[PDB]
Design a binder for this molecule. Structure first.
Ligand SMILES: *[C@H](O)[C@H](C[C@@H]1CCNC1=O)NC(=O)[C@H](CC(C)C)NC(=O)OC[C@@H]1C[C@H]1CCC
Lengths: 300, 297
């Protein structure tokens, strides 16, 4: 199993650059709107303590330089929605895919198209941590890069990049400008909650092991969801939700192993350790493959 | 972070190729579609296919090429080693600037995994020293390609043909020559003993340091040859002076001499990681090149 990104072409066709003064970042061009982080309107000095409504009132359409490559897109309207700027432009993007804006939950994975100056540099798979950070690879100028999933014809945009934390992890918003987690777009020191292990994804990984014939850890017992959740928290594992139990349905059906039986197997691993054994060629439990990711790499 | 090149320029080239009941992917550049020649085989052909004999018995019309909902008419075909070249009456307007290259073991590339001419996923691979790749490929993935992008130019280096019993993968360059001692017949094939790409392990250790992780460093040093003696004992590839030179920028950036990092790696090889982890991994990672690390740091 490897981290596998979605093909990035449909998103590459939507990346532009947005500049205000000398501050440049990336934007997302869909139909006749460009979406980008609102801190593009900030001087480096104003990022320390920005008053965004005040900064925006002083801006006009003609203060925004939007470019696809080196080709300018004329801005004909502007508005702020939470922490994102929406710039109406006079050209509808002919490469606009079928798309939607979604807000993902911790544990869910998505592909990031890392961009600089509106130019895509690389694509990689990220997991949203339970503390609402991602372990990105982002350099200066990467803001406005987006995270996405692709289902059939439709690009689901879920993440737009805004900042790095002192610990090196990354934070950002959905495409409605609402931050994931307790973060704000100010150049102030901000700390994330202590992180935890994504239980639903560990379970997905155990199911993947079973599918591949690696099943020594299956035991004869079961548990209730509440008993499991209370034990899991003592090992810094996330509690399971009802939605987690449901998204494990397909893998449970594929293997014939009930979700709560797998929970009891995981509980034994937590309480007793691996005892020098491995699972899928590893003594570490992997928590950044979702149930869908497992099905992706096992089917096509 | 393992990072692939953006795949859009390659996505615009992927098509579906069918012959008989065999369907796989092709690469459509200008007015030519490239694909694995074993598309012309049947069940009974695959064991010992005489490809020149099988191919002469085919007509242009035995090949169905589909780009989305549009069929492309094949107006000519030829074989170059293990690749079939199908001439079509339409030029791909999405053809990028491109070249065909043969990569060296230890080099990395991105794979666009495709099924039925449709892109499914992208990931980074290394050409192993034993000329396999550790890919994620299923039935119908043949004809998927590997590539690197420099400026606006796509350098195609890999086309996918097979899986080995061990679960690793084998394929060709875009001239149709295999990497490694493999053959496009339906037989169980073993690879040579694999080794670890040492220059890449060192690059990744430097990446761990750049991201503030240094538990594995030490105050010892080593000569190049003494390091290589230990490396070979542990089935690591030897480190050349060009490798040392290639690592210079990472050495400068971090203030750690290449041979000092070799001494750290030696200590890791002889003692293991004693439970610790580097950049999240319980194992030494060898599929990041020095360039991969630099570009991202
Ligand atoms: C082409 O799509 C397909 C891709 C492989 C299928 C499963 N995973 C793959 O990467 N290629 C093939 O099926 C090969 C065709 C021959 C003619 C080259 N064969 C193959 O990969 O077989 C796999 C198993 C180990 C070998 C045992 C043969 C008796």
């Amino acid at each position: 199993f490897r981290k596998m990104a979605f093909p990035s072409g449909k998103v590459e066709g939507c990346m532009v650059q947005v500049t205000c003064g000398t501050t440049t970042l990336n934007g997302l061009w869909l139909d006749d709107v460009v979406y980008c982080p609102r801190h593009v309107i900030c001087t480096s000095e104003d990022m320390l303590n920005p008053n965004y409504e005040d900064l925006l009132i002083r801006k006009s359409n003609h203060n925004f330089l939007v470019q696809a490559g080196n080709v300018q897109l004329r801005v004909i309207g502007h508005s702020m929605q939470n922490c994102v700027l929406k710039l109406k432009v006079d050209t509808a993007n002919p490469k606009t895919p079928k798309y939607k804006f979604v807000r993902i939950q911790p544990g869910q994975t998505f592909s990031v198209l890392a961009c600089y100056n509106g130019s895509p540099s690389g694509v990689y798979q990220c997991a949203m941590r339970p503390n609402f950070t991602i372990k990105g690879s982002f350099l200066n100028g990467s803001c406005g890069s987006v995270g996405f999933n692709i289902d059939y014809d439709c690009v689901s945009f879920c993440y737009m990049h805004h900042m790095e934390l002192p610990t090196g992890v990354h934070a950002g918003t959905d495409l409605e400008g609402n931050f994931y987690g307790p973060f704000v777009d100010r150049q102030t020191a901000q700390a994330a909650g202590t992180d935890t292990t994504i239980t639903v994804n560990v379970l997905a990984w155990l199911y993947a092991a079973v599918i591949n014939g690696d099943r020594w850890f299956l035991n004869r017992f079961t548990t209730t969801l509440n008993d499991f959740n209370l034990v899991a928290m003592k090992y810094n594992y996330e509690p399971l939700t009802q939605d987690h139990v449901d998204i494990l349905g397909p893998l449970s059906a594929q293997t014939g192993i009930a979700v709560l039986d797998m929970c009891a197997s995981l509980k034994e691993l937590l309480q007793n350790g691996m005892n020098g054994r491995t699972i899928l060629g590893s003594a570490l439990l992997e928590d950044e493959f979702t149930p869908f990711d497992v099905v992706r790499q096992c089917s096509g």
